[PDB]
């Protein structure tokens, strides 16, 4: 019954955003709740933000 089949492969790049889930190897897991600009981030004396 099938005349023709078309498959379309679409590629998408996903950037980390609020609601995505991150975790470490020790069982510490959590969802991203806030993305705050670099200047608001806690930083070391030499200026490196975390």
């Amino acid at each position: 019954g099938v005349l023709k089949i078309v498959k379309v492969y679409l590629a998408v790049k996903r950037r980390i955003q609020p609601g995505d889930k991150m975790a470490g190897r020790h069982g510490n897991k959590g969802v991203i709740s806030k993305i705050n600009p670099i200047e608001d981030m806690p930083y070391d004396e030499n200026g490196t933000p975390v």
Binding site: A11, K13, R15, P37, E39, N46, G47, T48
Partner: protein, 298 residues
């Protein structure tokens, strides 16, 4: 009533080509952290810099492609292009051409020398041509802007995440300033680690300019819409559209006002074209010689 002691850029210690130590002299206490934070906040996000926004590589269509004769895939190449540090004279968009044939790394130094364009790090690797019959020819678009503007912030071309800000890292120290007079003065030492697009002093005067400008005081339907659509929305033949535009007919409202007589009297329009135009107009409930009486309002 003791008027405040104001700062002025006093020293510049270029630890390197992209790392400096600016010092503002004689600042009243507590102002160290105040200006330190205001400035650190402007510098880390409000600085203007050039960044690659689009790239046109020959033979490549989608960024997912991989190239015959190139070590890294197109994605890696665009990711390399993100790190292209360019300082442009006085423009908000410049096209760089990169032609390279041979074996070995294709660095930013291989980019065609433009008079305006300054390439901060010529040894910056963009590619790696594997075989000696391999070659790349690409057009890198560099634009001026602010902050981090991703490619997702939207033709056989590709888009690259724009990192406009010239500054990577900022640090500051408050340190007591000298001079036996008054004694209770400090000096703000701003340690900068930029990408080499911007000079220390102008970065400071621009952060200060943005700050000061933020502080600028504190004070206290009828008619058919289709008529304002461009003629291109009618989807005429290229020729007809070009002829109409050549007659200063850029919108549907302009077209529906003209009559057959007037249109045929134009140098470039014949019976075929007029027939086509009447057909496309009739297909949308429109015609020639339409009165809209009031062309236009505001």
């Amino acid at each position: 009533v003791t008027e405040f002691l104001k700062p002025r850029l006093v020293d510049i210690e270029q630890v390197s080509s992209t790392h400096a130590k600016v010092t503002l002299e004689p600042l009243e206490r507590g102002f160290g952290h105040t200006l330190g934070n205001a400035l650190r906040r402007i510098l880390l996000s409000s600085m203007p810099g050039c960044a690659v926004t689009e790239v046109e590589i020959d033979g490549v269509l989608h960024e997912y492609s991989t190239k015959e004769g190139v070590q890294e895939d197109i994605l890696e190449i665009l990711l390399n292009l993100k790190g292209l540090a360019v300082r442009v004279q006085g423009k908000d968009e410049v096209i760089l051409t990169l032609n390279k044939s041979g074996i070995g790394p294709v660095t930013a130094a291989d980019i065609t020398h433009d008079g305006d364009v300054e390439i901060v790090k010529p040894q910056h690797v963009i590619c790696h041509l594997t075989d000696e019959n391999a070659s790349i020819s690409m057009r890198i678009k560099v634009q001026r802007g602010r902050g981090y503007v991703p490619a997702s912030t939207r033709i056989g071309r590709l888009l690259v995440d724009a990192c406009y800000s010239p500054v990577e890292r900022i640090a500051y120290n408050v340190e007591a300033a000298r001079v036996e007079q008054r004694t209770d003065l400090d000096k703000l030492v701003i340690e900068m680690e930029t990408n080499g697009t911007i000079d220390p002093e102008e970065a400071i005067r621009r952060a200060a300019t943005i700050l000061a400008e933020q502080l600028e005081a504190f004070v206290d339907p009828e008619f058919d819409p289709i008529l304002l659509r461009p003629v291109d929305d009618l989807e005429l033949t290229v020729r007809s559209a070009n002829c109409l535009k050549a007659e200063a007919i850029h919108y549907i409202g302009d077209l529906v006002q003209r009559t057959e007589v007037e249109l045929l009297k134009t140098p470039n329009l014949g019976k075929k074209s007029l027939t086509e135009i009447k057909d496309v107009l009739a297909s949308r409930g429109l015609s020639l010689g339409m009165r809209l009486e009031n062309w236009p309002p505001a």
